[PDB]
């Protein structure tokens, strides 16, 4: 499944 | 439909936003593990969808190790298409009706004591899917009679009845997602309305239940609205509050407007408490079914009563 991004 | 495209004009220009940074204090929690990978096998085993996955939160990681996860009921396509939602848009599938009861067997083998449960739209039912909620709630509380249910409904376009036969099925917490405000309603959830969705809240609280709702910021809201709403919900009955973040699934979704700061959140649990609500819980990656059981203690024994 597809995760929301968080910072890099 | 027409609706669709209007829907694909207003993405294509939420595209011409780029992808926004996100601030540091947005970061993941954990990494795969042997819970998540055992509880992945069990929702595909038992043909399930989670929302953790369809909705692609960041906390999955975080959740699942604690064995914490919340089901999607009615499929992974949903009828409506919401600017914040990731969640697949289609035509579903015939109804499952043999859903209920494999739900309610993994939360036996899980073995959790408070189960928190939501779904798509189905307006392709002609109920609206109103018997698929409710009986999903009956079928897991027959099976873990001890098990506490947390059911978060779309509003069946506020229909009585339907929302009656979800009411009797008689969850623990009754939840239903305002999430922004008046301002900027249409254009993040159009096949809602706020009043609507504030009835639908009064309908459970009438009902004997106890409520739950929530906000998504950084979507074009001022926190004097996010107040207002916080007051609207209250005002309407609603018991349990989670004041969140809004991360962006795609350039086709809407632009992030504000990154709330992690001390303005705390503000905001301040001033929620301050208006009565028995729970409260904030914060950039909070969401809906958090801690949910925790949150759930926590309201269960507030002055403030629920
Ligand atoms: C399943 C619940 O997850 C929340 N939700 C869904 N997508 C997002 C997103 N991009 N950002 C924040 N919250 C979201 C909504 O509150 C919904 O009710
Ligand atoms: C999976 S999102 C939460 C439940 C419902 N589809 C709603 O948006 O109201
Ligand atoms: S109704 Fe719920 S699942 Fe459907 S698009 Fe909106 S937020 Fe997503
Ligand atoms: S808040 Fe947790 S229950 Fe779904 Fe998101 S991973
Ligand atoms: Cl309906």
Same mark, same amino acid.
């Given at each position: 499944?597809?995760?929301?991004?968080?910072?890099? | 439909?027409?609706?669709?495209?209007?829907?694909?004009?207003?993405?294509?220009? +939420?595209?011409?936003?780029?992808?926004?940074?996100?601030?540091?204090? $947005?970061?993941?929690?954990?990494? $795969?593990?042997?819970?998540?990978?055992?509880?992945?096998?069990?929702?595909?085993?038992?043909?399930?969808?989670?929302?953790?996955?369809? =909705? !692609?939160?960041?906390?999955?990681?975080?959740?699942?190790?604690?064995?914490?996860?919340?089901?999607?009921?009615? !499929?992974?396509?949903?009828?409506?298409?919401?600017?914040?939602?990731?969640?697949?848009?289609?035509?579903? =599938?015939?109804?499952?009706?043999?859903?209920?009861?494999?739900? =309610?067997?993994?939360?036996?083998?899980?073995?959790?004591?408070?189960?928190?449960?939501? !779904?798509?739209?189905?307006?392709?039912?002609?109920?609206?899917?109103?018997?698929?909620?409710?009986?999903?709630?009956?079928? $897991?509380?027959?099976?873990?009679?001890?098990?506490?249910?947390?059911? *978060?409904?779309?509003?069946?376009?506020?229909?009585?009845?339907?929302?009656?036969?979800?009411?009797?099925?008689?969850?623990?917490?009754?939840?239903?997602?305002?999430?922004?405000?008046?301002?900027?309603?249409?254009?993040?959830?159009?096949?809602?309305?706020?009043?609507?969705?504030?009835?639908?809240?009064?309908?459970?609280?009438?009902?004997?239940?106890?409520?739950?709702? +929530?906000?998504?910021?950084?979507?074009?809201?001022?926190?004097?609205?996010?107040?207002?709403?916080?007051?609207? *919900?209250?005002?309407?009955?609603?018991? $349990?509050?989670?004041?969140?973040?809004? *991360?962006?699934?795609?350039?086709?979704?809407?632009?992030?407007?504000?990154?709330?700061?992690?001390?303005?959140?705390?503000?905001?649990?301040?001033?929620?408490?301050?208006?009565?609500?028995?729970?409260?819980?904030?914060?950039?990656?909070?969401?809906?079914?958090?801690?949910?059981?925790? *949150?759930?203690?926590?309201?269960?024994?507030?002055?403030?009563?629920?």
């Amino acid at each position: 499944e597809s995760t929301x991004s968080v910072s890099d | 439909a027409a609706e669709g495209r209007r829907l694909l004009r207003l993405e294509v220009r +939420n595209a011409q936003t780029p992808i926004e940074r996100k601030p540091p204090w $947005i970061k993941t929690r954990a990494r $795969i593990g042997p819970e998540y990978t055992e509880l992945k096998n069990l929702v595909r085993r038992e043909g399930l969808h989670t929302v953790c996955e369809e =909705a !692609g939160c960041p906390n999955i990681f975080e959740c699942w190790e604690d064995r914490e996860a919340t089901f999607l009921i009615g !499929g992974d396509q949903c009828t409506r298409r919401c600017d914040f939602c990731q969640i697949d848009t289609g035509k579903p =599938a015939e109804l499952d009706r043999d859903e209920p009861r494999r739900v =309610a067997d993994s939360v036996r083998t899980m073995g959790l004591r408070y189960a928190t449960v939501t !779904g798509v739209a189905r307006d392709d039912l002609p109920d609206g899917g109103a018997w698929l909620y409710a009986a999903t709630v009956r079928a $897991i509380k027959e099976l873990n009679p001890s098990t506490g249910v947390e059911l *978060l409904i779309p509003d069946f376009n506020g229909e009585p009845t339907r929302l009656a036969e979800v009411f009797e099925s008689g969850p623990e917490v009754l939840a239903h997602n305002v999430e922004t405000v008046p301002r900027i309603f249409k254009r993040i959830r159009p096949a809602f309305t706020y009043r609507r969705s504030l009835g639908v809240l009064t309908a459970a609280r009438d009902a004997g239940l106890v409520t739950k709702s +929530n906000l998504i910021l950084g979507l074009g809201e001022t926190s004097d609205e996010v107040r207002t709403a916080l007051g609207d *919900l209250r005002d309407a009955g609603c018991d $349990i509050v989670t004041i969140t973040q809004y *991360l962006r699934p795609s350039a086709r979704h809407h632009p992030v407007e504000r990154w709330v700061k992690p001390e303005e959140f705390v503000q905001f649990a301040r001033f929620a408490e301050g208006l009565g609500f028995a729970g409260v819980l904030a914060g950039p990656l909070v969401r809906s079914s958090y801690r949910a059981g925790r *949150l759930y203690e926590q309201a269960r024994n507030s002055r403030a009563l629920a």
